[PDB]
Symmetry: D3
């Protein structure tokens, strides 16, 4: 058996989003990024000549990216933000009493504590494994999945799961 | 006399900002970008061997970028947004009655009608000529200034002035 | 009125194709490329804040690229190739008596004399103006259209039309 | 002793080739790519200041690439292609009865089952170790060799050998 | 606990320097490079949402780069160079009796034997750990630090320390 | 007749050199760069399908680059440097009385006043037209030649000649 590592990466695997980091003692101003995602995986080359078809990987990365793209990333588990539902908006009040309000539909509520690159990457990795499907990955012999997310190309975070 | 065209471009000449486009009949959701700026100019090579010192160009592009970076870009002349001052926030009401509110300090109020790439580029070009200084540019023989702004590397707008 | 130049460019605006150059006294071996296309245009910024919406440009460039992608590029006007229809194949006989045969469906018959970068670019430019629609371009004030095609990133050809 | 990992990568380490994937139940149309190869290795830094001279690595990667470049990649061990010698051509008949014919000299016969990125990478890795020479690699303390091949920059396969 | 790997990389993390390689039996001519440095590290994501703040990493990489930038790199432990102090210059005499002389202030004396990419990388790694501070890295849970240095983008050396 | 513009650009069209800028009132420290050159030209597409064969352009750009590569760039017409021949070295004395000495063979004597990007570009343009040959360019209908030189990718100078 022959192991290969596949990498799919593209300026297409992007989500252009607004965010701000907040944690204990720190809040920054609202801004945004063209976030980019790459996926790496390892398995044995199968009888058909592939570890797993690149086209499936690309389809599923684009799908996950598209869910995030063109929204404000709202970290629904933050311990330093007060997230209120007001009519059809989310109102966010910070530790320093700063207030934001956005239409709910402009936001993507993500089960993270901070909109950091690291926590966004963990979320995406989990979503990708779900979307490609873990049993399907195992049929293809895949035993390692790894996502890299960048806020900007100069700063990236990479997370993995052995499966 | 020998003409040369200088180009300065860098992932450093960036402003990571939130925005949304609105015009008659169209509003999009809040999102953001790593905007990037390049500057091109033309003049004669001077006796010192330069058209104009690259380091001055870089300093002034970084300065203009830094003013925008890490904010929401607020187009203060939009004919389809109602921009209200509420306490220490800007409240923005759209044609479709969508409402946003952001701390004033999180916003940069820019004298444009739309936060399009084109209008942002025009603004930056004007600011750059002011910051480098038009009489200084003329002492160096510069007769053409051109800015390229990208929301994402795949889509760029370029504007110029003959001076 | 304010002129802007728009550029759309992406590793997505690709057509991965087989070809070979043939002209009088020269034939090369069958090979291929990841061809890439960029589009540049000029017009006035309209009241909506755009010269013309980038999304329309991207949609139409992708459409033209997709027609070419994943085929052999067959220059149907070559004066040095004998192009025969044999059953459901094209059989190509060269000046040096070299012979090729490919299923017709694997080929894209393009109204060019040589599969050079230059002639491919001319073809794409014409197709793009047709697909975006010339009257529509004129409604947006566009007066210049320019395509760059590369066989490989190190060698590109650029063609334009004033409209 | 101090371990270092060397990487050599260049748009020069390219082979511009035609191919098509075929496996049980699947055939695609003839097309091509600018394939790109990078080489990574690990060893101890030697007394001369290098793990192994980059110039040797580059020379040998270019040599292997040049053997493939500008041809159709013919997978000589495919279980779904019927590969016939007809005069000075190879005639290829597929499971769906599609037929191709190319001059033999336009083809590179490679001891692989599929012209996938993965199997091409395995072939290149083996060829590179042969060309650099395994005993020479061991004199330099090299204990790991790894090749990355891309059909297009967005999709890459990486294979390695511990030596 | 969740491990993440952070990467910071930028054309900004550059040192534009002159050098030449010399070892037993080999001297090359004086030349230079735009050297580039990237830093990778691993640790657990902390309660604040980061492994360690990217801004600290960037600040410290820029600081180390700036110390080297715009000088001749003088390997002070070379066994094949005779390094003499002459007035306010360093005079370097080679095995082949070639002689150089540079103002001392134009040189950076680095505790390496050869100005190879590998040895420069080792030096930078050590300097970076000192500048970020090893106890601080350990407070953040960082257990792995890795530097990549390139003389040119096509040839890179990577070194690491487990901490 | 159909005009096309050809561009050839590659990390291969490089010269890795040492230099320093000096002009009246300014001297900088010795350092270096991976300089890069691109060539753009315009002409009509000829009957063979090319403006001019890319391979000729590439060959001649590589040749010019190779002459400069791996040396100190010595501006032989500087009005602020005293350039002395001492044995088999060049000794350079600056306005501030700084002194350098390099073997003559490590230097390329270039007929420029400053080793600026602009003046290096002018020199390269002239050399390229000579190497490709002006009458040959005219046989191909070429009427415009343009060189871009960068010290680093963030700062480029472009010069042209109408022919
Ligand atoms: N580690 C880290 N992750 C981030 O997402 C991050 N974002 C910032 O804006 C500043 N530092 C950061 N540092
Ligand atoms: N021309 C143009 N300029 C933009 O800034 C723009 N932004 C978008 O989000 C979509 N289309 C655009 N089209
Ligand atoms: N001008 C030019 N156009 C091409 O498409 C081209 N293709 C080649 O393979 C070699 N030279 C070329 N030269
Ligand atoms: N894993 C994988 N390897 C390939 O070479 C490949 N080529 C394709 O055209 C489509 N999917 C692929 N998938
Ligand atoms: N391994 C290696 N390291 C270098 O820094 C290096 N520099 C050169 O100029 C030529 N070969 C090299 N080889
Ligand atoms: N115009 C310009 N040309 C150069 O070559 C240049 N080099 C520098 O080091 C600093 N500024 C520069 N400015
Ligand atoms: Zn951010
Ligand atoms: Zn946008
Ligand atoms: Zn070709
Ligand atoms: Zn393919
Ligand atoms: Zn070097
Ligand atoms: Zn310099």
């Amino acid at each position: 058996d022959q192991i290969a590592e596949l990498l799919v990466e593209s300026p297409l695997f992007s989500f252009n989003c607004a965010h701000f980091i907040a944690f204990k003692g720190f809040r920054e101003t609202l801004h945004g990024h063209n976030y980019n995602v790459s996926l790496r995986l390892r398995g044995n080359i199968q009888g058909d000549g592939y570890v797993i078809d690149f086209s499936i990987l690309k389809e599923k990365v684009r799908k996950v990216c598209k869910q995030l793209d063109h929204h404000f990333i709202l970290p629904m588990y933050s311990d330093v933000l007060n997230i209120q539902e007001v009519n059809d908006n989310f109102k966010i009040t910070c530790e320093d009493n700063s207030e934001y309000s956005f239409p709910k539909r402009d936001c993507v509520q993500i089960p993270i504590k901070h909109s950091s690159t690291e926590e966004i990457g963990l979320y995406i990795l989990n979503q990708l494994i779900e979307e490609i499907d873990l049993p399907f990955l195992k049929t293809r012999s895949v035993n390692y999945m790894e996502v890299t997310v960048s806020e900007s190309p100069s700063q990236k975070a990479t997370v993995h799961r052995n499966i």
